[PDB]
Symmetry: C5
Subunit: 270 residues, 5 copies
Amino acid sequence: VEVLEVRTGPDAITQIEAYLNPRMGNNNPTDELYGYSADINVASSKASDNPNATTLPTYSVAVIKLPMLNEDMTCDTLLMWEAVSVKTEVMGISSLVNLHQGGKYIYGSSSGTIPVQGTTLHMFSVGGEPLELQGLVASSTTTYPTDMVTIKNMKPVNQALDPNAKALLDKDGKYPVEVWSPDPSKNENTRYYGSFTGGATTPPVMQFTNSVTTVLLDENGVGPLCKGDKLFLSAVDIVGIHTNYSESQNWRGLPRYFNVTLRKRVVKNP
Amino acid sequence: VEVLEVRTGPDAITQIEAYLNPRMGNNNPTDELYGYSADINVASSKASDNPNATTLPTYSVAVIKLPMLNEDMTCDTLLMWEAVSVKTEVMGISSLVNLHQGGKYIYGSSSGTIPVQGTTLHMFSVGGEPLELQGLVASSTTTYPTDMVTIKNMKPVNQALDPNAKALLDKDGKYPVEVWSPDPSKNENTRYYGSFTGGATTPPVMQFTNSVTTVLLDENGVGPLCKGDKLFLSAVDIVGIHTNYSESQNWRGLPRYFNVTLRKRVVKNP
Amino acid sequence: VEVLEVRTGPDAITQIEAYLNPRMGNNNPTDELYGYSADINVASSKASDNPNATTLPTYSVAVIKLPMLNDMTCDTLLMWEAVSVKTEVMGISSLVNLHQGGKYIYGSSSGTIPVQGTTLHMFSVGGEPLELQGLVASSTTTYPTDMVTIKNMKPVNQALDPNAKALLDKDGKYPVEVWSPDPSKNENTRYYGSFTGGATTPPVMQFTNSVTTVLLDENGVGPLCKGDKLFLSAVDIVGIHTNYSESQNWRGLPRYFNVTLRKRVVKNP
Amino acid sequence: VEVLEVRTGPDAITQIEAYLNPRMGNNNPTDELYGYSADINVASSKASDNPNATTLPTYSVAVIKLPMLNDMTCDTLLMWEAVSVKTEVMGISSLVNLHQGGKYIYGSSSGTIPVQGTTLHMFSVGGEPLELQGLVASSTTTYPTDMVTIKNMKPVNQALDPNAKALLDKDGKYPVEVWSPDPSKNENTRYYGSFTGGATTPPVMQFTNSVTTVLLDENGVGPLCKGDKLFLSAVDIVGIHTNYSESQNWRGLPRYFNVTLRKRVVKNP
Amino acid sequence: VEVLEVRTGPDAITQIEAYLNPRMGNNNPTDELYGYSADINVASSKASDNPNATTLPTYSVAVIKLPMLNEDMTCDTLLMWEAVSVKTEVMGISSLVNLHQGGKYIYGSSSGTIPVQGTTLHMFSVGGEPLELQGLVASSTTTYPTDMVTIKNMKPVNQALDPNAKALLDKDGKYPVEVWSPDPSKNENTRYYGSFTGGATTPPVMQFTNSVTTVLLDENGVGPLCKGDKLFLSAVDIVGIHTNYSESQNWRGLPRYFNVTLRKRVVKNP
Ligand SMILES: CC(=O)N[C@H]1[C@H]([C@H](O)[C@H](O)CO)O[C@@](O[C@H]2[C@@H](O)[C@@H](CO)O[C@@H](O[C@H]3[C@H](O)[C@@H](O)[C@H](O)O[C@@H]3CO)[C@@H]2O)(C(=O)O)C[C@@H]1O
Ligand SMILES: CC(=O)N[C@H]1[C@H]([C@H](O)[C@H](O)CO)O[C@@](O[C@H]2[C@@H](O)[C@@H](CO)O[C@@H](O[C@H]3[C@H](O)[C@@H](O)[C@H](O)O[C@@H]3CO)[C@@H]2O)(C(=O)O)C[C@@H]1O
Ligand SMILES: CC(=O)N[C@H]1[C@H]([C@H](O)[C@H](O)CO)O[C@@](O[C@H]2[C@@H](O)[C@@H](CO)O[C@@H](O[C@H]3[C@H](O)[C@@H](O)[C@H](O)O[C@@H]3CO)[C@@H]2O)(C(=O)O)C[C@@H]1O
Ligand SMILES: CC(=O)N[C@H]1[C@H]([C@H](O)[C@H](O)CO)O[C@@](O[C@H]2[C@@H](O)[C@@H](CO)O[C@@H](O[C@H]3[C@H](O)[C@@H](O)[C@H](O)O[C@@H]3CO)[C@@H]2O)(C(=O)O)C[C@@H]1O
Ligand SMILES: [Ca+2]
Ligand SMILES: [Ca+2]
Ligand SMILES: [Ca+2]
Ligand SMILES: [Ca+2]
Ligand SMILES: [Ca+2]
């Protein structure tokens, strides 16, 4: 679609806000361990790697419906909502500042417990359509739960780049992060931003503020354009691993807030 | 409230300073371990987790009364104090540079003792009303002391985002950091800045200088506006954990200094 | 070659995109451990050090053929000039995995240690092969003969031997522990590398589609593609995987490139 | 004083330079362990904590007498204004030493553990003594009477007691664990500090002669030297050296200052 | 000498390149462990600390002879070469990415070996005369090899700043880093840049690129001026410690490349 100028005048700007709850494996709000995975079940061998669905963190996604812009669809030009900037925040960070939760002792049984630590993964995206994904796994011989969306008919090539392994992030809590990542060869109409630090016991590091805005405009001054007046918000915020007294382990996630400013953009009627 | 222009002229600027003492759990200045929590008392299980009030760090808050500005409340326009910038500093940082305090030896009994280390959490906020808070916990089955302000009738939803778990930071030493964090969906009239590094034994890192100012104006050039001529200052500065000889542990906190510059802002009378 | 002005007008600009699969040692897509090295075989001594080819990560290289620009007698020619690149290490979140068969973090009730330790990231974009300098940990290492390594090593190759030079002209052949970008050459290539060592170091990576690197030099000139060929080179070693028996495999990830090129006028030589 | 404009013309600018040696506890240059604290002596309990004077790092301070500027009648006077400073921790590379007596890294065939753990770096440049705020880890600690510490301590002193104030007016007398710069004062000093804690943390330091710190405030005014005196203050604890017996000493390094000053006109008070 | 303006015109700019090989202790290219120190030999006691020359890393220095500028030395003004900017690079960084070198196992005898790690020291300097040095040691009772250049007649004062402990970096592989550092009270005619990270097992961190230039001009816009048409390049690049199977240890250094751009500067004839 040919993109023209920004539409000026009163009522040309709008703003939405939303939060996405984490989807660490216990994904129902009545689950005792909502916001965590179940105890990790580890592969027995290369050939026998059957991770339980509840142990696998997935991506969060929400579709926000925006006000309808075009009365009749037959004028030479149309309007689309253009995402211009976002304020985003990982919520409840200070919940990890807690040394009394049941778990593994830091020293002996007189000490506090080890807080959430280890691998972290933070991703947010804002687009005018679903986030486009690339499949890649640690091991093609893992058998994934069938009620999740994973790579069909995996082979060892899927341990690196197979250009046939593509998907859309179109379902909340279904696409495992260990299988899918943002596809940089597409996503022309989405801006995504991601951060990873690995390790078993790494100290998690996070900032929180209401003073920072990310501008979503591309090199040409154009932000994501919302097809069918729909805005797509995606996230994952794995903040580390909680270790229990018995040494079993649960992934821990946190929710993410989005505040997106949008404006009206003229496009040519296709 | 329709915000208008900055009032210029002599005496249009004022400046306040304040310090907030840490509320680590021992919050009475006659407490032997004032500036620390009591020995952390750890849950025996998921179901049984009763942290003592003295073991839970809370937010500091102070209200600064500013000179009154409006004689007539008849006038078509009124003046409010607008917070423009802040210098803020964590005080007594070098008190941590101490290897003789009674505790746990670094190596054997000929060595110095382990200094304060582990999880850190730093936050300051400057606003024209109480900081708005969102509740989220590590465990919804925790029983919090009834004399603290925490989430009423928790369910497992409270381990992630429950949109009903909201509060105002309107009491000093009452809101546990492990339960509450700044709400990014509100706080239009407060600037907050936060930094977290987790981990069991992580070395703390801190800077101190009198050369750095934070500017508090939003993207329209408007800082926090002080309702009823009150300026709200909030903080928490957990600098880590002290470990005792028996391996019991206390949170350690430090005081925070604020120097705030304010100016007169014209607003439309409501 | 004398470099003249940029050629303006419609069709003055083109873009390409490619990805390079990692070459960690298992370099065939049907290899069970594709994207990993084989179990590291360690030297029993300084004198006795014969690493298997499957255990030695090598540089990835791709040559992209660009639209033919030039008749070859005009007094000025056109060359494709690489102006900027968006590049991305793909599959980063694949490391966010605690269930893979391996070594337990704590006892046997816990998750397994994820990929961690030494990392090496390099990308380059050039108008000819990346020029290489040879330097090794040990000059007494015997390398696999079917790889390209330093000929007739002496202890001088543990430091700078001005004679140990090569071109990155084959994919999966030049070991990273032998070869590195030659800063005394490479006038026509831009390279960018970072290294963090250690055995257990947590890996750190970012991913976004918002970042572009400008390739122009201090005279405003990017790499100029000789014979309309664009050279893309990479290595992305994201750490070490540890197996249950404590054997270890290097782990690598693929890299994406999106390069923008413009027509540059040059004086005919 | 009412501060007026900068005085221009020939000879309006000056430079001084100085070094301050560290005061870690062994503060006499003939001390066998000069530049180190004596072996750390640890408290037996909350009630009993009697650190020896020689175990407690203190701030360094020097007063530089500047050229006499003024007669005192004139409606306006000149003061030296500290404009900028180049400052350097000297002898950083002295830490790059694994043969020194100490605790083995692995077994007795290995090198010894180098200086590591808690570090504290501070420098200040002002026109009067640095103003200090008292705060300690323990109010029941008994400090050496020959040092300057907080009078009549109570548990409030484990946090902010607004009465606990002092001036850094003596070299090697004010313990860093008792005093820090007071941000509620120090209008006429600029101070800069960084702290990293932990018991075994690797120290990190840079050294260059290319970096200057500008000392002007948001009104373009630097510290003004009362009575033509310039105050330089510092502490540079670079970590802890551990002996074979596992007893431990703080290690400090000297700091160099090069300050540029100019003449500032002020109203006679 | 009085420094005047930059000389303009054709042929006013020259460019040199050079490499400096590391001087870790095994400093002869035929040495089996060239580019490493010999096994560290640890002090028996404070009184008995005799490090072997081969165990002590020294600075690298090279003198580059530049084209002769002044035809008649009686003219009232003269030209000097002025170092304007440098591109510099540590070479062979990726040689460290090697887990099969003989050494100490990361885990048991089935694993890779521990790569080079621990204390790093990086310095480069570009000057128009020898880099000026200040003496400072960890221990004044250390007995250094007489074949090296160290502090004469050490006393305890040399554990801190002795103003009489000065030297010039005027010989390659002779001035140990543990005794000498750049003197900030001098070096008006040299620019030096240094970086240190200690510890015994710290991961080394290095970058490499050909896209970065350091500008050498001072605040008056004057770079180092090459006395007698000599350009002084100095370096040390200790990238860590290699541990052998028997647990003995060797410093590891890497060579450094320089590409310095120079221009002609007018000076008044003294
Ligand atoms: C992430 C998180 O919140 N982890 C909890 C865990 C988990 O709920 C559990 O591991 C499932 O993943 O529970 C922790 O406490 C449990 C632990 O102390 C075990 C003993 O190791 O006992 C459990 O209670 C038992 C009780 O002991 C028995 O008398 C009874 O038969 O059953 C109870 C419930 O099964 C504790 O809940 C843990 O450390 O694993 C606390 C963590 O914070
Ligand atoms: C990078 C990676 O994927 N590593 C795998 C490894 C490698 O595939 C393997 O080390 C070759 O380099 O395999 C891991 O699982 C193996 C391990 O559990 C060993 C026990 O030490 O047994 C292997 O299965 C055997 C099995 O024991 C026999 O019954 C069978 O007949 O032969 C099988 C094949 O050898 C496991 O596959 C590993 O931890 O080493 C899992 C890693 O994820
Ligand atoms: C933050 C802080 O200052 N921690 C102290 C602690 C705390 O005061 C205490 O743990 C309460 O939270 O005390 C430390 O010293 C005590 C320790 O040596 C214990 C031995 O386990 O003894 C205590 O003194 C006892 C004494 O031993 C008895 O004879 C007497 O009957 O009672 C005394 C007081 O209970 C020490 O105070 C500690 O290591 O726990 C020192 C820390 O710095
Ligand atoms: C920096 C470096 O490359 N270190 C080497 C070292 C050094 O060359 C050496 O330690 C002197 O600094 O050698 C390493 O391999 C040796 C090691 O396995 C030892 C056993 O601890 O044996 C040496 O070979 C011996 C062999 O074992 C004997 O049977 C024979 O009689 O003598 C041989 C030579 O002494 C190995 O060379 C090491 O681990 O120390 C490998 C390091 O990479
Ligand atoms: Ca594409
Ligand atoms: Ca809102
Ligand atoms: Ca060259
Ligand atoms: Ca004040
Ligand atoms: Ca001097």
